[PDB]
C-alpha cells in the first residue's frame, strides 16, 4: 500500500510480513519475523577462533 | 591536504564496525549426523578451556555414537515478537466515589510499566528495547460490573497541561489524542509508535539526568532516564456532576515490531519499587530450590 | 601461540605469557561514529595516541575472604591524563575500551576470578533491610572512581540479579592454574551516538572470586589484582570550560 | 450497507490476538535507530550461552550463598567414591534454576534437545586427577556405585592444561518434546541423572591445598528448541510495587 | 465482565480472584462480557506426542 | 450476510483517528479557490522567520512592557563586563516565549536542530564597539567571567555599517531530539546558555547618547524539525468565553 | 468506516457452523506427525468390516 | 533592517562535521497540526431549567468559544478546509440513557 | 473511483493520497500531504537577493 | 600512577626470561650533546 514508514522496525536486517488498514505503519500487526540467529555473538566472541578437535589453549 | 605519512596511513575516522560474527537462518533445530568410534591422539573435543570466555563447542556427535536424526522442530516461537507480543497488565487506575485517592472523578497515571512483576521481569531480560505497542483499556466497576457510563482517556505528553479536575480546560483536547468510550462498549484499543528521543527505551540507566553535585537529597534521581518518560495517561468520567459509579481501568500492553539489545541476568529477588532495582537485604533468597546434601536428591 | 600476547597502543605495551585468548564484546570492534548515526553538528576532536593508551589505575589485594569489586566506565578515567582533560572540557564523549586485568600467583596457589563487563550496571540498595525504605545509593557507590567499590552482596550483584548468569556478558576467567590475566575489548554501547562521560557510565567492570583463593602457609600471601585499561577510538565534542561533574 | 453477520468471538479481547489498532499519532516518525552492539533475535541464541549451574544448592544463609556456585573435590581413599549428583531436568526445581537456560525454559511449556555441562577445575596447577561423569537415562535409579554409573553415557575426565571438560546430555527421549518434569505423573518427562565419581583420586604434592573446587557451566546444544509459550512459575512481587 | 485464562502445565494456577497470575503477561487470556456473544478461539494440536 | 467479528476498539471515538464519515450535502461543490498570497504549507516555514526575543524579560507593569523588547549597552570600565545572559532552551519558560518559534514549539513534545539569534545594534552611527557573544553547551555553569565564556562557541561582534550579527546555536546534543527542558530531571534536555560580554567597550564621541539598545531576533536553522504533536502549556481563557 | 448492515443470524452460535476463530498461540508449531499404522479416513471403511 | 531573516548557517560560523539528517518534517504539515478533533461547542438540554427547559436547543455555529482550538486556527488569517463533526451525548453525570 | 470533486483541496499544487467510500470527495480521509516548503516567502521576501558571504548593505 | 603516564612496558615473568624497554628518541634537537648537571641538562634524555 501507500503508507508512512513509521514502524519501530523500519530498517531491520530481517523482513516482516504484516497486515494494516491505516496510513501509519506502526498500526500494523506483529506479523512473522525472519528466522535468523547468531549465537556466536554471545557464546563465542573470541578474537582467534579455536576448533572443536583442538586443545583450546596451545 | 594530508602529506606526513602517519596521517595518510591512519585509521582515525573508520566508521565501519568490524563484526566477527554474522546471522544464519535457523528455522529448525539442528540435525544429528551419524558418528562412530574415534580412537585418536591429538583430537580432543571433550576438553575445553572455559577461562577463554566462550561456551563449549563439543557436540553430541563427538561425545557418543549417534544416529542420524532429521529435526524439523521449529524455532519460531522463540523470536522476540513471539515472546513479547502478548498483552499483559501494566497499570490499574481507580476512580472511586467516596475515596481518599481519586474522589474528584479523574485520575492521572504516569506511564511506567514497572509496577507489575510478570511484564517487568520479561522486559528486563534486555538492556535496550525498541518497539511499537497496542494498548487496551478494560473498564468496569470493582465487582466486575458493566454500567452505562461514558469515559474520556487522554494522552498527555510531557509539557502538555495535566488536567487538575474533571472539568479542566485541558479536556478540550484540541491537539492531544483522546478516546471517548462507554464501559458498555468493548475495551478501547489503540496503536502507539516508538516515542523516545533515544533510539531505544532502556530499562537500566547507570547515571544521573543532570550535572552538579549529587548530594544525598538528589540521589533519588540516580537512574532516572527522561528518555523513557513518555508522559501521562489521564482519565475522567465525562460530566459536570459526580458519576454514580466507582470505576476501575486496567491497562494492557502488547508490544509489536520488537528489537532488543544486550541481554542480562534475570531478576531473582522480589521487586519493591518502580524503576529502581532495590531488593530487601534481610531477605536475600537463593535463585532456586535447595536440598540437604550434594550427594542426595 | 594463544597463551602468549602483546598489546601495544599509544606509547604503552603490555605482555603476558599466560593468556587465554581475547574476548571482543558482542563480537564487534570499537569504531568511530558514522555520519548517519551522528546528530551533533560540530566537528569532533579525536586526540588519538594521547588518550587511546593503557592506563594502570588500581591494585586490589585478593584475600581468602574477598567478596569482589566493580569499577564504572568511563568514570575510572575522568580524572586521569589527557583523556580526563578531554572528558572534562567536552559535553560529548564516546569510545571503546581494551581492558586487561592482571593477577599472577604460583603453580601452588589456586582460585578463580570471574572478570565481566556489564552495560548499564545500575546499583540497588538493600532498602533498609526490611525492604520498606526506598533508599538510593550515594554518588560514591554509583561512581566510585579509580578505587572501585567492594560488593556488599556478590550473589545478587548488589542489584537483585544473579551473578550465576553474569556469563551472559562479555567475560573471561582468571583461573590461577591456567592464566594470569583477562583481556576484554568493548565497543561503545549506548542508545545514543555520544553521551556525557560524567553523568553516564556505559558499563561496569566486575572482578569477583567464585572459587576462593587458597595456598599453604609459607607461600607468598599477597596476591594483587591490577586493573589496566585503554580507551579506543575516543571522540569528543561540545567544547566549553572544564567541568568535573 | 453491505450485508454482514456477526460471529461468536465478537467483542472479545484475546491477549494474544495479533490485530490492527487505530494509530494515535498520525504522520509521526520515530527517532532513527542507530547501531547498537549486541542485538538478539531469538531466545535460543541465549540458551546456548553457558551460565553457572548451582550443583551445590545446599547453603541458604545470606553469607554463604556464593558457595552454591562451586563444589569440592579432595584427596580420597581410592574406593571410587561419589562426588556429587543432580537431576538433568532443566526446567525442574533444583540446580538448573541458577542458569539462564533454566529461567528461559520457564516461559515455555515444552522443550526438546541435547544439553551440555562443562566443568572447570579450579585447583592448583600441581593437582591432578581423573573423574568419571555419568548421565543415566530415564528409568535408571540413582547409581549406588561407580560400576553401575559406568553403564550409562559417560565421560572420563583427566585434569591437565585444559581446565575443563564437557559432558553432553544427549537427547534420549521417547517423545519429541518433554514438558517440565516434576514429582508425580510428570516424572514421565524426566531427563535422568548426572553423577560424578572419582575415577582415580585427587593427588597433590607437598605444599598444595588438599581441597579444590569445580565450577559447572551449563547450556543447550544447537538442536534445542522450546514451544508453547507460557508464564513463568515465579512472580517476583509480594504486594503492590510502589 | 469475565476473564478466561489458559494455564499450561507449569504456569502458576490462580488461587484467588486476585491472584498475581491474572496479570497474564504470557498466557493467553480472553476478556469478555456475559452480554457479548459467546467467546470463541482456535486451539492447535498441543501434545508432546 | 458476510461473516464478520468485532474487535476491541469497536465504537470508540479516537480524536486523532483519520477515518471516513458520511457527507451531509450530496453533490455539493464548494466556492472555487482564487489565488491568495501567502499560503503556508508547513509550520517549519514559520520557524525560520525571526521574531523578537525578550532577553530583557524583567519589567512587568503595563506601561513598561515595550522595554522587554530591547536591552542596553553603554560605556563601561574595560573589565570585560557582563552585559546579559539567557538560556538557549527554545521551549522553556523565559525569553523565548516571546518568539513565534517558541510558541509553535509549544505544540510539539520534541524538537531537533540548530538555532540562531541575530542581534541588531540601534545606537547612533558614531557609536562603536566589540561584544563577545558565547554559547555554552550543556554541563557548563553560567560563565563567571569573559575568559570562561570564551572557551565555548562564540562570536566576536564589531559594530559598523552592518547593524547586526548572528550567533548560531549549533545543535550539540547527546540525543537526536530534545523534549522541552524544565527544572528537574528534564534539565537533561537543556540546550545551554548564551552570555554577552564587552570585548572592548562602547565608545562614543562628544554629542552622542551614552546608552543604546540592542534588539534580538531569533529563529531556527534549516535542520530544525519538531515531532510528537501536543497541546500547548497555556490555555488562554479563564471562564467560559461569551 | 465501510458501510455495513447486520443481518439475522448475527451473534448466534450454531454448533455445526464451520467458521474461523482467533488463534490463541501465535507462531506455535505442533509436534510432527510420525507414521502410525491404521489410519482411517471414512466411517464407511469401518462399516465394511 | 532589510526585513529578511539571517542567511548564516552552522557551516560558516563553526567547524562542522558531516551529519546525515533523516529527521522527518511530516508532522508539521497543516493537516497534521489541525486534523485532530477538539471541542468547539457544548449544548445543554436540562429538564427544570432557566435556559432550554423546552426540550430543544439552537446553537449558532461559531467555534471561537473554546481557547485551545481557537488559538490554533487564529495563527492564520484565511483557512479553507473540510471537516468531520462528532457529537458526544450523555447526561450531566456522564451516564448513557435510552433516549 | 468515480466520485465528485468536492474536496476543499481540489486544485492544490500538492497532491494527497486518501481513502473514501462515498460519491463526495470531501468525505475522504485527510491522507498524506506532499512535503514541499517555501520559507523564503516569509523569511526572505527581498526584491534583490543578497548572498551569505556578502555584506548585506553595500 | 604517575609513571604510568609515560612510555612504558608491562613485563610478565615466564618462559621468556627477558623483556625489552625501548627508550625511543624523543628530543627537540636532532642531536643531544652529553648531558650533565647545569645548563647541559637541556640535553637530558629522561628517566627510567
Ligand atoms: N545454531 C543453530 N540452531 C539451529 N539450527 C542451526 C544452527 N546452526 C546451523 N543450523 C542448521 O544446520 C545447517 C548448517 O549446518 P552447518 O553448515 O554445519 O553450520 C543449516 O541448514 C541450518 O538450518
Ligand atoms: C489515548 C491513550 C493512549 C495511551 C498512551 C500510552 C503511551 C505509552 C508509551 C509506551 C512507553 C513504554 C514504557 C517506557 C518506560 C518505562 O515504563 C519506565 N519509565 C522505565 O523507567
Ligand atoms: C447534521 C449536523 C451537521 C452539523 C453541521 C456543522 C456545520 C459547520 C461548518 C463549519 C464552519 C467553520 C467555522 C466558521 C466560522 C467561525 O466559527 C466564526 N463564525 C468566526 O466568526
Ligand atoms: Cl524439565
Ligand atoms: Cl526546550
Ligand atoms: K534441521
Ligand atoms: K483493534
Ligand atoms: K465515521
Ligand atoms: K469466530
Ligand atoms: K536530509
Ligand atoms: Na576442544
Provide DSSP, H26-53.
Answer: GGGBHHHHH-S----------SS-SS-T
Alpha carbon D225 to its chain's center: 13
> Using the beta-carbon criterion (under 8 Å), do H14 and C39 form an inter-chain contact?
no
**Is residue C157 a contact partner of residue C122, using CB atoms and an 8 Å limit?**
no
Nearest CA of chain B to the CA of C220: how many Å? 24
Give the helix/strand (H/E) hosting C84: helix C81-89
Q: Which residues on neighbouring strands pair with residue B89, listed in sequence order?
A: B252
In angstroms, what CA-CA distances link G47 with A31, D69, I1?
46, 65, 59
Q: With respect to CATH, is domain C1-245 assigned 2.60.120.20?
A: yes
CA–CA distance, B106 with F12 (Å, rounded to integer): 19
Tell me, letter by letter, the H, E, C secondary structure of chain G: CCCEEECCCCCCCCCCCCCCCCECCCCCCCCCCCCCCCCCCCHHHHHCC
Residues 6+ apart with CB under 8 A from I30: D26, F18, H31, H35, I16, I18
Tell me, rounded to whole angstroms, the distance of Cα A28 from its chain centroid.
18
Residues of D with Cβ-Cβ distance to A28 under 8 angstroms: 20
Number of alpha carbons in the 13 Å side-chain half-sphere of residue F87? 20
What gap in Å lies between CA F233 and CA F103, rounded to an integer? 10
What is the C-alpha to C-alpha distance for residues B178 and F16, in angstroms, rounded to an integer? 8
Rounded to 10 degrees, the C-alpha dihedral A29/A35/A39/A42 comes to -20
Backbone angles phi, psi at D100, to 5 degrees: -65, -35
CA triplet D71, D74, D80: central angle to 5 degrees?
A: 100
Cell numbers found for residue F120: 541588531
Of I5, I29, I43, the CB nearest to F48: I43
Bridge partners of E30, per DSSP, are: D14, E4
Residues of D with CB under 8 A from a CB of F: 2-11, 13, 17, 19, 21-26, 28-29, 31-32
Experimental method: X-ray
* 3-class state of residue I37 by DSSP: coil
Other CB atoms within 10 Å distance of the CB of residue D160 = 14
- Backbone phi and psi for residue B138, each to the nearest 5 degrees, phi listed first: -105, 115
**Residues whose CB falls within 8 Å of the CB of residue A12, separated by 6 or more in sequence, listed in order:** B259
Q: Provide the 3-class DSSP secondary structure of residue C57.
A: strand
Contact residues of ligand 2, CB 6 A cut-off: B 111-114, 133, 135, 153, 155, 177, 179, 190, 192, 201, 228-230, 233, 275; D 24
From the candidate CATH numbers 3.40.50.300, 3.40.50.720, 2.60.120.20, 1.10.10.60, the one assigned to the domain spanning F1-242 = 2.60.120.20
Question: Whole-angstrom distance between the N-terminal and C-terminal Cα of chain A?
Answer: 59
Q: Following CA atoms F100, F101, F102, F107 in sequence, which dihedral angle do they give, to the nearest 10 degrees? A: 100
**Subunit contact A37:B259, Cβ cutoff 8 A:** no
Cβ of residue B220 closer than 8 Å to a chain F Cβ: no
Around B247, how many Cα atoms within 13 Å sit in the side-chain half-sphere? 31
C-alpha cell belonging to residue C226:
591490577
User: Which sequence spans correspond to the domains of chain C?
Assistant: 1-245
Is the distance from CB of E28 to CB of D16 less than 8 angstroms? yes
How far apart are the C-alpha atoms of A40 and D46, rounded to whole Å?
Answer: 10
Q: How far apart are CA F11 and CA F6, in angstroms?
A: 10
* φ, ψ at J11 (rounded to 5°): -95, 130
Provide the 10 A C-beta neighbour count for residue B65.
11
Q: Which residues contact F114 (CB under 8 A, 6 or more apart)?
A: C41, F168, F169, F170, F171, F220, F221, F223, F224, H10
Q: Which three cell numbers stand for residue E2?
A: 469475565
Per-residue H/E/C for chain D: CEEEEECCCCCCEECCCCCCCCECCCCCCCCCCCCCCCEECEHHHHHCCCEECCCCCCCCCHHHHHHHHCEEEECCCCCCCEEEEEECCCCCCCHHHHCHHHHHHCCEEEEECCEEEEEEECCCCCCECEEEEEEECCCCCCCCCHHHHCCCEEEEEECCCCCEEEEEECCCCCCCCEECCCCCHHHHHCCCEEEEEECCCCECCCCCCCEEEEEEEEEECCCCEEEEECCCCCCCCCCCCC
**How far is it, in rounded angstroms, from Cα B75 to Cα B72?**
9
Cα distance between residue D117 and residue D88, in whole Å: 10
Domain boundaries, chain I: 1-58
Closest CA to B250 of B172, B171, B183, B201: B183
In angstroms and rounded to an integer, the radius of gyration of the C-alpha atoms of chain H is: 24
CA distance D209 to D116: 29
Q: Is F221 helix (H, G, I), strand (E, B) or coil?
A: coil
Assign 3-class secondary structure to chain B.
CCCCHHHHCCCCCCCCCCECCCCEECCECCCECCCCCCCCCCCCCCEECHHHCCCCCCCHHHHCCCCCECCCCECHHHEHHHHHCCCEEEEEEEECCCCCCCCCCEEEEECCCCCCHHHHHHHCCEEEEEEEEEEEEEEECCCCCCCCEEEEEEEECCCCCCCCCCCCHHHHCCCCCEEEEECCCCCEEEEECCCCCCCCEECCCCECCCCCCCCHHHCCCCCCCHHHCCCEEEEEECCCCCCCCCEEEEEEEEEEEEEEEEECCCCCCCCCCCCCCCCCHHHCCCCCCCCCCCCCC
User: Considering Cα of B194, then B195, then B198, then B202, what sign does the dihedral take?
Assistant: negative
Distance CA J45, CA J27 (A): 8
Q: How far is CA A29 from the centre of its chain?
A: 17
Pick from A27, G18, B145, B90: nearest CA to D15: B90
Of the residues B151, B230, B273, B274, which should be mutated to test ligand 2's pocket, given the most ligand atoms within 8 Å of the CB? B230
Residue A4 sits at φ, ψ, to 5 deg, of -90, 150
- In whole angstroms, give the CA distance from residue D24 to residue F16: 6
Q: Residue H12: which H helix or E strand, with range? A: helix H10-13
Residues A47-54: contacts with CB within 8 Å, 24+ apart? Answer: A47/B20, A47/C21, A47/C22, A47/C23, A47/C24, A47/C185, A48/C2, A48/C21, A48/C22, A50/B52, A50/B57, A50/C2, A50/C21, A51/B57, A52/B45, A52/B57, A52/B58, A52/B59, A52/B62, A53/B42, A53/B43, A53/B44, A53/B45, A54/B44
Return d(Cα I35, Cα I12) in angstroms, integer.
13
Q: How far does residue C27's CA lie from ligand 2's centre (Å)?
A: 32
What are residue D103's phi and psi, to 5 degrees?
Answer: -70, -40
Please, are residues H36 and F18 in contact by the beta-carbon 8 Å criterion? no
Residues 6+ apart with CB under 8 A from D78: D198, D200, D201
Q: Map grid coordinates 537431576 to a residue.
A: D87
Q: Is the peptide bond before B237 cis (omega within 30 degrees of 0)?
A: no
Q: Is C108 helix (H, G, I), strand (E, B) or coil?
A: coil
The whole-angstrom separation of Cα D37 and Cα B144 is 46
DSSP state of I17: B
Cell numbers 483499556 correspond to: B137
H16-55: burial string, b at 16+ Cβ within 10 Å, e else: beebebebbbbbbbbbbbbbbbbbbeeeeeeeeeeeeeee
What DSSP designation does J46 have? -
Report the distance separating Cα B57 and Cα B36, nearest Å. Answer: 18
C-alpha cell at D9: 468471538
Gap between the Cα atoms of F80 and F157, Å rounded: 14
Least Cα distance to B197 among F186, C90, C234 occurs for F186
Write down the residue that cell numbers 562426588 correspond to: D83
- Chain J partners of C4 at a C-beta cutoff of 8 Å? 14, 16
Retrieve residue H69's grid coordinates.
482550538
DSSP letter for each residue of chain E: -EEEE---TTSPPP-STT-GGGG-SSS-EEEE-TTSPPP--B-------
Rounded Cα distance between C34 and B10, Å, is 17
Q: Are B207 and B178 in contact (CB under 8 A)?
A: no
Rounded to whole angstroms, the Cα distance separating F102 from F83 reads 23
Q: Which helix (H) or strand (E) holds C150?
A: strand C149-150
Residue F39 grid cell: 499560503
Other CB atoms within a 10 A radius of the CB of residue H57 amount to 11
Residue D7 to residue B216: CA distance in whole angstroms: 61
| DSSP-assigned letter for residue C32 | P
Which element (helix H / strand E) includes C119?
strand C110-119
**C-alpha C21 to ligand 1 mean position (Å):** 26
Q: How far is CA C233 from CA B14, B21, C10, C56, in A?
A: 9, 21, 12, 18
Residue with cell string 570499537: C30
DSSP F168-189: EE----SSSSEE---SSGGGGG
Q: Is A32 on the interface with D (CB under 8 A)?
A: no
Is H21's Cβ below 8 Å from some Cβ in D? Answer: no
Report how far Cα B98 is from the mean position of its chain's Cα atoms.
Answer: 35
| HSE-up of residue B147 (Cα within 13 Å, Cβ side) | 19
Cα angle at D51 between D47 and D54, to 5 degrees?
Answer: 125
Determine which residue's CA is closest to atom 19 belonging to ligand 3: H62
Rounded-to-integer distance, Cα A45 and Cα B11, Å: 23
Residues A3-36 as b/e (b if ≥16 CB within 10 A, e otherwise) read bbebbbbbebeeebebebebbbbbbbbbbbbebb
Using CA of residue D91, residue D93, residue D97, residue D103, what is the dihedral sign? positive
Fold classification of I1-58 (topology level): Rhinovirus 14, subunit 4 (4.10.80)
Residues A46, C170: C-beta atoms closer than 8 Å: no
Our answer on whether the CB atom of H63 is closer than 6 Å to any ligand 3 atom is yes
Q: Which three cell numbers stand for residue H60?
A: 449558532
> In 3D, which of C106, G12, H25 has the Cα closest to residue F44?
H25
Mutate to test the interface with C, among J11, J14, J17 (most CBs of C within 10 A): J14
CA R_g for chain D: 24
Residue F50 CA to residue C31 CA, distance in Å, equals 40
Residue B217, beta-bridge partner list: none
Angle subtended at Cα A25 by Cα A21 and Cα A29, rounded to the nearest 5 degrees: 65
Q: Where are the alpha helices (DSSP H) in chain F?
A: 43-47, 100-105, 146-149
How many other C-beta atoms lie within 10 A of the C-beta of residue I14? 11
Find the helix or strand (DSSP H, E) in which C205 lies. Answer: strand C203-214
Beta bridge partners of C116: C171, C206
Euclidean distance between CA atoms F69 and F53, whole angstroms: 7
Q: Which helix (H) or strand (E) holds C175?
A: strand C171-175
Q: Which three cell numbers stand for residue B43?
A: 583430537
CB proximity I23 to A under 8 Å: no
| Binding partners of J (≥3 Cβ pairs within 8 A) | C
Query: Nine-digit cell at A3?
Result: 503508507
B189 interface with D at CB cutoff 8 Å: yes
Q: Within 10 Å of residue B114's Cβ, how many Cβ atoms?
A: 18
Residue that is written with C-alpha cell 524583567 in the block: F58
Can you tell me the distance from the alpha carbon of H99 to that of F66, in angstroms, rounded to the nearest whole number?
57
Q: Are C30 and C187 in contact (CB under 8 A)?
A: yes
CA distance B64 to I8: 77
- DSSP code per residue over A15-43: --B----SSBGGGS---B---EE-THHHH
CB of H71 within 8 A of CB of F236?
yes
Residues A15, A21, A26, A31, CA torsion sign: negative
Helical residues (DSSP H) of I1-58, grouped into ranges = 40-43
Amino acid at each position: 500500500s501507500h503508507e508512512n514508514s513509521n514502524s519501530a522496525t523500519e530498517g531491520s536486517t530481517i523482513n516482516y510480513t504484516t497486515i494494516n488498514y491505516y496510513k501509519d505503519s506502526y498500526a500494523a500487526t506483529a506479523g512473522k519475523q525472519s528466522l535468523k540467529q547468531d549465537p556466536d555473538k554471545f557464546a563465542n566472541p573470541v578474537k582467534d577462533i579455536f576448533t572443536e578437535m583442538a586443545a583450546p589453549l596451545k | 591536504g594530508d602529506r606526513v605519512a602517519d596521517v595518510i596511513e591512519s585509521s582515525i575516522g573508520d566508521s565501519v564496525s568490524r563484526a566477527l560474527t554474522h546471522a544464519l537462518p535457523a528455522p529448525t533445530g539442528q540435525n544429528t549426523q551419524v558418528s562412530s568410534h574415534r580412537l585418536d591422539t591429538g583430537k580432543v573435543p571433550a576438553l575445553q578451556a572455559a577461562e577463554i570466555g566462550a561456551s563449549s563447542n563439543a557436540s553430541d556427535e563427538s561425545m557418543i555414537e549417534t544416529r542420524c536424526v532429521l529435526n524439523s522442530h521449529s524455532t519460531a516461537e522463540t523470536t522476540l515478537d513471539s515472546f513479547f507480543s502478548r498483552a499483559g497488565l501494566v497499570g490499574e487506575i481507580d476512580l472511586p466515589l467516596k475515596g481518599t485517592t481519586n474522589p474528584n472523578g479523574y485520575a492521572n497515571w504516569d506511564i511506567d510499566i514497572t509496577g507489575y512483576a510478570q511484564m517487568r521481569r520479561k522486559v528486563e531480560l534486555f538492556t535496550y528495547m525498541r518497539f511499537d505497542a497496542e494498548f487496551t483499556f478494560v473498564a468496569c466497576t470493582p465487582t466486575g460490573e458493566v454500567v452505562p457510563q461514558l469515559l474520556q482517556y487522554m494522552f498527555v505528553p510531557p509539557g502538555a497541561p495535566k488536567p487538575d479536575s474533571r472539568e479542566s480546560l485541558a479536556w478540550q483536547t484540541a491537539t492531544n489524542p483522546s478516546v471517548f468510550v462507554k464501559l458498555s462498549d468493548p475495551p478501547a484499543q489503540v496503536s502507539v509508535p516508538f516515542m523516545s528521543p533515544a533510539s531505544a527505551y532502556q530499562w537500566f540507566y547507570d547515571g544521573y539526568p543532570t550535572f552538579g553535585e549529587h548530594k544525598q537529597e538528589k540521589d533519588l534521581e540516580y537512574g532516572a532516564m527522561p528518555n523513557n518518560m513518555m508522559g501521562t495517561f489521564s482519565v475522567r468520567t465525562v460530566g459536570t456532576s459526580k458519576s454514580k459509579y466507582p470505576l476501575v481501568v486496567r491497562i494492557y500492553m502488547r508490544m509489536k515490531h520488537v528489537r532488543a539489545w544486550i541481554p542480562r541476568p534475570m531478576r531473582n529477588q522480589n521487586y519493591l519499587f518502580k524503576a529502581n532495582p532495590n531488593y530487601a537485604g534481610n531477605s536475600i533468597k537463593p535463585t532456586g530450590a535447595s536440598r540437604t546434601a550434594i550427594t542426595t536428591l | 601461540s594463544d597463551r602468549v600476547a602483546q598489546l601495544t597502543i599509544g606509547n604503552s605495551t603490555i605482555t603476558t605469557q599466560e593468556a587465554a585468548n581475547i574476548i571482543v564484546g558482542y563480537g564487534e570492534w570499537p569504531s568511530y561514529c558514522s555520519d548517519s548515526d551522528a546528530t551533533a553538528v560540530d566537528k569532533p576532536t579525536r586526540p588519538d595516541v594521547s588518550v587511546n593508551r593503557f592506563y594502570t589505575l588500581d591494585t586490589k589485594l585478593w584475600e581468602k575472604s574477598s567478596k569482589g569489586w566493580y569499577w564504572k566506565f568511563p568514570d575510572v578515567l575522568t580524572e586521569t591524563g589527557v583523556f580526563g582533560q578531554n572528558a572534562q572540557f567536552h559535553y560529548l564523549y564516546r569510545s571503546g575500551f581494551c581492558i586487561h586485568v592482571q593477577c599472577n600467583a604460583s603453580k601452588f596457589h589456586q582460585g578463580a576470578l570471574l572478570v565481566a563487563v556489564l552495560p548499564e550496571y545500575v546499583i540497588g540498595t538493600v532498602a533498609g533491610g526490611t525492604g520498606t525504605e526506598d533508599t538510593h545509593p550515594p554518588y560514591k557507590q554509583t561512581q566510585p572512581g579509580a578505587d572501585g567499590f567492594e560488593l556488599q552482596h556478590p550473589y545478587v550483584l548488589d542489584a537483585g540479579i544473579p551473578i550465576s548468569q553474569l556469563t551472559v556478558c562479555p567475560h573471561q576467567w582468571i583461573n590461577l592454574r591456567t592464566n594470569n590475566c583477562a583481556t576484554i575489548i568493548v565497543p561503545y554501547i549506548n542508545a545514543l551516538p555520544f553521551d556525557s562521560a560524567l553523568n553516564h557510565c556505559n558499563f561496569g567492570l566486575l572482578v569477583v572470586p567464585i572459587s576462593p583463593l587458597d595456598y599453604d602457609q609459607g607461600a607468598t600471601p599477597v596476591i594483587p589484582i591490577t586493573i589496566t585499561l585503554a580507551p579506543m577510538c575516543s571522540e569528543f565534542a561540545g567544547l566549553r570550560q572544564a567541568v568535573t561533574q | 450497507g453491505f450485508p454482514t453477520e456477526l460471529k461468536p468471538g465478537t467483542n472479545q479481547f484475546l491477549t494474544t490476538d495479533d490485530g490492527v489498532s487505530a494509530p494515535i499519532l498520525p504522520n509521526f516518525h520515530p527517532t532513527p535507530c542507530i547501531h547498537i552492539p549486541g542485538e538478539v533475535r531469538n531466545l535460543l541464541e541465549l540458551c546456548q550461552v553457558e551460565t553457572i549451574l548451582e550443583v551445590n544448592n545446599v547453603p541458604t544463609n545470606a553469607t554463604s550463598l556464593m558457595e552454591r556456585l562451586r563444589f569440592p573435590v579432595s584427596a580420597q581413599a581410592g574406593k571410587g567414591e561419589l562426588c556429587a549428583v543432580f537431576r538433568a531436568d532443566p526446567g525442574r526445581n533444583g540446580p538448573w534454576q541458577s542458569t539462564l537456560l533454566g529461567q528461559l525454559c520457564g516461559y515455555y511449556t515444552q522443550w526438546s534437545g541435547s544439553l551440555e555441562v562443562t566443568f572447570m577445575f579450579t585447583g592448583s596447577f600441581m593437582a591432578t586427577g581423573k573423574m568419571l561423569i555419568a548421565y543415566t537415562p530415564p528409568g535408571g535409579p540413582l547409581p549406588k556405585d561407580r560400576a553401575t554409573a559406568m553403564l550409562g553415557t559417560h565421560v572420563i575426565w583427566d585434569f591437565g592444561l585444559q581446565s575443563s571438560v564437557t559432558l553432553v546430555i544427549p537427547w534420549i527421549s521417547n517423545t519429541h518434546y518433554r514438558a517440565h518434569a516434576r514429582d508425580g505423573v510428570f516424572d514421565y518427562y524426566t531427563t535422568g541423572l548426572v553423577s560424578i565419581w572419582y575415577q582415580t583420586n585427587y593427588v597433590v604434592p607437598i605444599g598444595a591445598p588438599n581441597t579444590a573446587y569445580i565450577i559447572a557451566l551449563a547450556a543447550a546444544q544447537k538442536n534445542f528448541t522450546m514451544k508453547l509459550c507460557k508464564d513463568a512459575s515465579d512472580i517476583l512481587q509480594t504486594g503492590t510495587i510502589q
